[PDB]
Design a protein around this ligand. Structure first.
Ligand SMILES: [Mn+2]
Ligand SMILES: [Mn+2]
Length: 182
């Protein structure tokens, strides 16, 4: 199973389009699931994602208007439980009821969020953590020189291979990170 992970496009309010060099790489008929962190913009981008896969999961980020999209979810892909949330939630740890509800979100194999536009991908204590960054390199609060990125996960049995794609200078650069769940 191939899983596309992306978000934070902000089209067309901040960026008019995905970079050609990333969009080239995506075509119908290859990806089984999309996990989108939100901040797409207008419906056009959601429609585009729906050409690419039959199972599209998106969450609602800050200033996203379409309230039919859930704030957070937990999705099962193969043997993996994946949590998905935009990341602009401002809730303090001390509201114990809210904390109790977050347990379901932390008790997942792979955790994905967005919002910052800064990519990350690592293993910690048998769990894997991904922020795909922004696929358009849209600006965030502090910064303007955001490196466009997105993520593909190749999932098979108990092994996930995460590919991080980044647009640096002239070329797409790929890092390949292997994760096996014990
Ligand atoms: Mn954003
Ligand atoms: Mn955001």
């Amino acid at each position: 199973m191939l899983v596309l992970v992306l978000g934070d496009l902000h089209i067309p309010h901040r960026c008019n389009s995905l970079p050609a060099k990333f969009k080239k790489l995506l075509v119908p008929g290859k990806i089984q699931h999309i996990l989108c962190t939100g901040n797409l913009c207008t419906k056009e981008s959601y429609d585009y994602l729906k050409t690419l896969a039959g199972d599209v999961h998106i969450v609602r980020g800050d200033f996203d208007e379409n309230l039919n999209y859930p704030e957070q979810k937990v999705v099962t892909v193969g043997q993996f439980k994946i949590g998905l949330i935009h990341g602009h939630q401002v809730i303090p740890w001390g509201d114990m009821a809210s904390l109790a509800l977050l347990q379901r979100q932390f008790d997942v194999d792979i955790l994905i969020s967005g919002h910052t536009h800064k990519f990350e991908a690592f293993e910690h204590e048998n769990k894997f953590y991904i922020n795909p960054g922004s696929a358009t390199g849209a600006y965030n609060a502090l910064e303007t020189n955001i490196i466009p990125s997105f993520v593909l996960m190749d999932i098979q049995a108990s092994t996930v291979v995460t590919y991080v794609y980044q647009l640096i200078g002239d070329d797409v650069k790929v890092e390949r990170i292997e994760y096996k769940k014990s």
